[PDB]
């Protein structure tokens, strides 16, 4: 069930593995949640030079989050005095001439941005980079980082990793379920699309795109968009693991509440704007903006959901005509007519009207005509009801402007423009973002809101790039759940095995002071017909591969001269390595994780190749006739 | 031109030497020894089989005590064996895996090995607290180490794929004297019993005599059609035998400054890896790539006996100072003992 | 290529050329004489009893 960490011995392989990908740098490590937490546990606890440099970093971070000025002025005195002025009097400040002065100027003028300390951030980082980083790599905190990294990199999800509950949505090509990831106990949503019910509609593109689109957006944690942490499939379904929203959609709430007041709509608008800002910062127009695609959490806060029809305008701009009818901007509907973010402003405009009045604005007399809802959008200013305030009007005016020349949001600074709408004068957008505003609707506690077909080789190939894990989400999940409590158990377990070896005597590792390239645990195969796989500790040297079991020295080996090929092979569907040996013989090895396999291959190939070009040059060593 | 003229007259000196040599070829050694009785068949059998190395053995050497003997293997270790019981006095893991050669010092207090690390590492067997440190790492060659022999505990001679050999001072670490002349990878050496002279053999298929103290080459022996892999002095120090890729061994006398005898058959096509002389000089022992060691009559050039329990190449061999025994070492990972 | 290095070759060839050589018959006879002189103290050449052989039936050492 729970997450088990690989043994410390795993460090030999992951370190080379990361090193190959440049990922053993201060930059790359410091900026990962678990890397961060391990670095700091090191500096603060086990290294005296480093403690202050990080406390200082941290205090600044708490200072960038201070809400006011009156909160600010205060803390930035203590921060100065404590982490600088103390030092200055003892000559010992390990920072620039400029930096130091740049802060003290903002103090005597009492003009204190949230960035004051930014010249220092850079320099704390220079001060930590390089040399201090080096000792951390040598420390068993980096060994611990390698253990968590190994688990990360070996994720292969299946339905079984999930404890799956009630359905909380039906629609498009499948269903959504509440669920719990067993590892960590995290509640998530699970959106399950039936591959068949897809082919039937040649809908494959859309299914894929959602995945592509989700990945551009699911970084940063946006509170106002439903985001993804894993994707995986089985032969029949695609699965997305998603942010849980079990509160129902507006389309449904609307139908039960009836229409919302300006006040209540202002709340949703604001969260929705902010969601749009996020996506628009990453060049993604959402396009299917509407009550049914806005979701409520348990408390009534909202998220933009379902990015199937959403698309990227980074390199080239769409001109195509997609959306739900009655919420599409002019430039959209018109084919041969390109566009960007703009549609979402219009659609917002459209949508908000709807929350106030029970219908799309261009859907009077409950018509269905699809061609004429389009007409009303082209040359036509919409008449805004007598009951709407002056400020609501100017907003909708701004948002529904036939032309993009003169629509609100499309004049240079996105989002911001609409936030300055005096419809929102009353609001503070930092406080919107922190979800501090009480929502007007609290979902009560549940919501409720054919086959002859086959599946070829070349169907599943469409889905070959589908699975995926988002490092940022996984680390976050772990960091909030089991990381402290596992590091703990692990710590204790390793110190049993080690302190017990202080009795036994397995006490002077065999790799040290030689030319070993790598070592670790693998399972070689004895007799196939007995599922005999004996697990050994292997050491790789530049001209042989030694191995052993518990207690002994190595009794056995294989030389690099003897190895002809190294290949990947399938056995009872786990991946092994196949070393073919000169006597027409074979030698199979199973690794415990992807990266371990990936690495043992690169190194075995490198080593046999070099050793053979080497021996070839040495007259005493080569084979002659 | 002067560059022409010095090549011209090296060519002319070459002739002076060939001629001077033929002027002394008044008889052959075979003629001379036609009379004496043959050796009969030499029949040795495996006494000991030494088991431990996990890969090929590339080299071995005996201690003067005629009992302990050191070996080096592609398993990146040396083992120091007691032949009498088969016990392992020591087992040394090396710092570089690419070892090729080893040696036991006269005293039996130090050993030495090297390889593609390009260093001769001296291992003090007998430490302050019964351990085995590396006492020294003699660095300076610019190519693989191919052979080494102690003169005594404070000096040593090496041979290298950089085509030179060298005299070192162990305490200081210094390359005292170097020995240039060979135009190809030097592959083996042997110290004359009096330690004032050694010979080297090389991939140029010449072999050379050198004076230690003077750092010079006195004499150069051509004749082989191919790489000389192995070389050993006749016990009186007046001659030496070589073994080569041309499937022949040869005996060269120093004072007559030329070859006296080739050892061979049409039935033997592979190269020779190694050579030693029985205690009297009378037998010449050679290890071959066809797995067998051939034992030759040194004086009559006949082929007396064969040592043959080895499933791969015999890569090295040696005879004890007391003459009681012969050790053979193989690519099949074992040493055997023969007597 | 080098003039230094050709000068050097030749001086070496002079050392080699100006040695005192001896007759091969004398040389070879001197060798034959070595082999007889030590033929009796060479175990591989002559058959010794087990009780002088470290390796045959022997159990007992240091
Ligand atoms: C936005 C929308 C649906 C939807 O996406 N519902 C969701 C989506 C993600 C969720 N996370 N947590 C509860 C969720 C509920 C729901 C739906 C859509 C696609 C599906 F595959 C299943 C349900 N039906 C519908 O009309 N519109």
CSV table of C-alpha atoms in Angstrom, one decimal, chain B residues 2-3 6 9-10 13 16-17 20 23-24 26-27 29 32 36 39 42 44 47-48 67 83-85 180 217-220 234-236 253 255-258 260 278-282 299 322-324 326 339, chain C residues 1-3 6-32 34-36 38-39 41-45 48 52-56 58-59 61-62:
chain,number,residue,atom,x,y,z
B,2,UNK,CA,74.5,15.7,-42.8
B,3,UNK,CA,71.2,14.1,-42.2
B,6,UNK,CA,74.6,10.0,-40.6
B,9,UNK,CA,77.0,5.5,-42.0
B,10,UNK,CA,74.6,3.9,-39.5
B,13,UNK,CA,78.0,0.3,-39.1
B,16,UNK,CA,80.4,-3.8,-39.7
B,17,UNK,CA,78.5,-5.5,-36.9
B,20,UNK,CA,82.2,-8.9,-37.1
B,23,UNK,CA,83.7,-13.8,-38.3
B,24,UNK,CA,83.1,-15.6,-34.9
B,26,UNK,CA,83.4,-20.8,-36.6
B,27,UNK,CA,80.9,-23.5,-35.3
B,29,UNK,CA,76.2,-24.9,-30.6
B,32,UNK,CA,79.5,-28.6,-30.3
B,36,UNK,CA,76.5,-35.5,-25.1
B,39,UNK,CA,67.8,-35.7,-21.5
B,42,UNK,CA,61.1,-35.0,-18.7
B,44,UNK,CA,56.3,-33.7,-14.5
B,47,UNK,CA,51.4,-31.3,-7.7
B,48,UNK,CA,49.3,-28.3,-6.7
B,67,UNK,CA,57.8,-21.4,-1.6
B,83,UNK,CA,52.7,-23.3,-2.8
B,84,UNK,CA,53.4,-25.9,-0.2
B,85,UNK,CA,49.9,-25.8,1.3
B,180,UNK,CA,66.0,4.4,-24.4
B,217,UNK,CA,72.7,-0.3,-24.1
B,218,UNK,CA,75.7,-2.5,-24.8
B,219,UNK,CA,74.2,-4.9,-27.4
B,220,UNK,CA,71.2,-5.5,-29.6
B,234,UNK,CA,70.8,-18.4,-18.5
B,235,UNK,CA,71.9,-18.9,-14.9
B,236,UNK,CA,75.6,-18.0,-15.6
B,253,UNK,CA,75.1,-15.6,-26.3
B,255,UNK,CA,80.3,-12.7,-25.6
B,256,UNK,CA,79.7,-14.1,-29.2
B,257,UNK,CA,77.1,-11.3,-29.7
B,258,UNK,CA,74.7,-13.4,-31.6
B,260,UNK,CA,73.3,-19.7,-31.1
B,278,UNK,CA,65.9,-25.1,-15.1
B,279,UNK,CA,68.5,-24.5,-12.3
B,280,UNK,CA,71.4,-25.9,-14.4
B,281,UNK,CA,70.5,-24.0,-17.6
B,282,UNK,CA,70.0,-27.4,-19.3
B,299,UNK,CA,71.7,-27.5,-25.6
B,322,UNK,CA,66.1,-24.3,-5.5
B,323,UNK,CA,65.0,-25.8,-8.8
B,324,UNK,CA,62.5,-28.1,-7.3
B,326,UNK,CA,57.8,-24.9,-12.0
B,339,UNK,CA,57.6,-31.2,-10.5
C,1,UNK,CA,64.0,14.1,-39.0
C,2,UNK,CA,66.2,15.3,-36.1
C,3,UNK,CA,70.0,15.7,-36.6
C,6,UNK,CA,70.8,10.5,-35.9
C,7,UNK,CA,74.1,11.7,-34.3
C,8,UNK,CA,72.9,9.7,-31.4
C,9,UNK,CA,72.1,6.5,-33.3
C,10,UNK,CA,75.5,6.4,-34.8
C,11,UNK,CA,77.3,6.8,-31.5
C,12,UNK,CA,75.3,3.9,-30.2
C,13,UNK,CA,76.2,1.8,-33.2
C,14,UNK,CA,79.8,2.6,-32.5
C,15,UNK,CA,79.5,1.3,-28.9
C,16,UNK,CA,77.9,-1.9,-30.2
C,17,UNK,CA,80.6,-2.3,-33.0
C,18,UNK,CA,83.6,-1.9,-30.8
C,19,UNK,CA,83.2,-4.8,-28.5
C,20,UNK,CA,85.4,-7.8,-28.1
C,21,UNK,CA,83.6,-10.8,-29.4
C,22,UNK,CA,84.7,-14.4,-29.1
C,23,UNK,CA,84.4,-17.5,-31.1
C,24,UNK,CA,81.0,-19.1,-31.0
C,25,UNK,CA,82.7,-22.5,-30.4
C,26,UNK,CA,84.3,-21.2,-27.3
C,27,UNK,CA,81.1,-19.5,-26.3
C,28,UNK,CA,79.0,-22.7,-26.7
C,29,UNK,CA,81.5,-24.9,-25.0
C,30,UNK,CA,81.7,-22.6,-22.0
C,31,UNK,CA,77.9,-23.1,-21.8
C,32,UNK,CA,78.0,-26.8,-22.3
C,34,UNK,CA,78.1,-24.9,-17.2
C,35,UNK,CA,75.4,-27.5,-17.7
C,36,UNK,CA,77.6,-30.4,-16.7
C,38,UNK,CA,75.5,-28.1,-12.3
C,39,UNK,CA,73.7,-31.1,-13.8
C,41,UNK,CA,72.2,-30.0,-8.4
C,42,UNK,CA,69.2,-29.6,-10.8
C,43,UNK,CA,66.0,-31.5,-9.5
C,44,UNK,CA,64.1,-31.2,-12.8
C,45,UNK,CA,67.0,-32.9,-14.6
C,48,UNK,CA,65.1,-37.0,-6.3
C,52,UNK,CA,63.8,-34.4,-0.5
C,53,UNK,CA,60.7,-33.2,-2.5
C,54,UNK,CA,58.5,-30.5,-0.8
C,55,UNK,CA,55.5,-31.4,-3.0
C,56,UNK,CA,55.1,-35.2,-3.4
C,58,UNK,CA,54.7,-34.5,2.1
C,59,UNK,CA,52.4,-33.2,4.8
C,61,UNK,CA,56.0,-27.6,7.0
C,62,UNK,CA,56.4,-24.2,8.9
